[PDB]
Amino acid sequence: LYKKAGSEFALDSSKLEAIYATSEADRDYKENAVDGDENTIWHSAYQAADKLPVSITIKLDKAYDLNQIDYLPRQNSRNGHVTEYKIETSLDNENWTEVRTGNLEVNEAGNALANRGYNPIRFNTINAQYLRFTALKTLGDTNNKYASAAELVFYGK
Numbered sequence: 001l002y003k004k005a006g007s008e009f010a011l012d013s014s015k016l017e018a019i020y021a022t023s024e025a026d027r028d029y030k031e032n033a034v035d036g037d038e039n040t041i042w043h044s045a046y047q048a049a050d051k052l053p054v055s056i057t058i059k060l061d062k063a064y065d066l067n068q069i070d071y072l073p074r075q076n077s078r079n080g081h082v083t084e085y086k087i088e089t090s091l092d093n094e095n096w097t098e099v100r101t102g103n104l105e106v107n108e109a110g111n112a113l114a115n116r117g118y119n120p121i122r123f124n125t126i127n128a129q130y131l132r133f134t135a136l137k138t139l140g141d142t143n144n145k146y147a148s149a150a151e152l153v154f155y156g157k
């Protein structure tokens with residue numbers, strides 16, 4: 001059911017701009033989520049009072065008919081691995097359509113995602129220039145408090 005990175009429908013990261021996130025920690029800025037770089041991450045704030053849900057909004061250079069994104073978890077640490085998510089899209093960054101929710105498989109020990117690479121998330125084709133990705137449950141030294149993402153990969157035309 002899933003496309004892979006080499007699909008003709010995979011959008012280049014240059015077509016993406018992170019325009020908002022609930023919070024950002026350290027130098028793990030929102031833009032790091034869509035820079036095509038597996039080594040950089042967006043990470044939400046992780047002070048004692050910080051908690052879920054958190055979200056990040058990606059703006060595309062124009063509207064696309066989207067039907068998949070891949071979530072790439074942090075490569076060097078499980079901190080912020082997203083295990084339950086929501087996807088919303090819009091044409092105007094104001095009026096959102098709820099596209100889907102879902103879960104990502106966790107490893108046996110329950111400390112990291114089972115798939116440490118690109119985790120595909122499919123959905124019925126929807127025309128969108130903005131996508132809001134919300135982390136509802138996450139893993140970490142403390143679970144369910146902060147989220148991270150190394151990449152979000154978009155598929156559409």
Ligand SMILES: OC[C@H]1O[C@@H](O)[C@H](O)[C@@H](O)[C@H]1O
Pocket residue numbers: 043046079080140141
């Ligand atoms: O407490 C959460 C923090 O833990 C650190 O070990 C990590 O480098 C940070 O990115 C953040 O995840």
Ligand SMILES: [Ca+2]
Pocket residue numbers: 032033034035036037038039040041042149150151
């Ligand atoms: Ca990155």
